[PDB]
Ligand binder design. Sequence first.
Ligand SMILES: Cc1cn([C@H]2C[C@H](OP(=O)(O)O)[C@@H](COP(=O)(O)O)O2)c(=O)[nH]c1=O
Ligand SMILES: [Ca+2]
Length: 135
Amino acid sequence: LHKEPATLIKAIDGDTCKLMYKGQPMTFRLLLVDTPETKHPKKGVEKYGPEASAFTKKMVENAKKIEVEFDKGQRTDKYGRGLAYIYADGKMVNEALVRQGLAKVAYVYKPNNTHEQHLRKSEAQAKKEKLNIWS
Ligand SMILES: Cc1cn([C@H]2C[C@H](OP(=O)(O)O)[C@@H](COP(=O)(O)O)O2)c(=O)[nH]c1=O
Ligand SMILES: [Ca+2]
């Protein structure tokens, strides 16, 4: 994979944000994870939804550098959102959330699963530590 610079435009929730990428603004959705909903009426405000949003917001707003790393398959989803692993000062936001029990590993669609095992190992640790979503 290969990291590329991006500039934060606006944090939306735990797993979705707006970034300036290659000159253009677009919304990104974190690969392989799912933070709880705080927007869609069908799901309502789910437990830890507000917590995941705050964690992500803090993490991306305070970073000196943001980088996007597309996987080997499709780079956007059906809603036109970029699908990537996002790094804040070298730290993967996707992993950070999973490690804290603020996201579950989900939407594993091959071949966009390069970091699946890494994320799963962090999810298991969060589970055994009974963190947030796993408490
Ligand atoms: C992370 C991810 C989400 N999605 C889709 C699946 C879900 O579609 P449906 O909404 O049609 O079920 C939605 C989940 O994202 P949200 O967690 O942002 O809702 O985005 C992908 O298509 N591929 C991905 O890699
Ligand atoms: Ca979500």
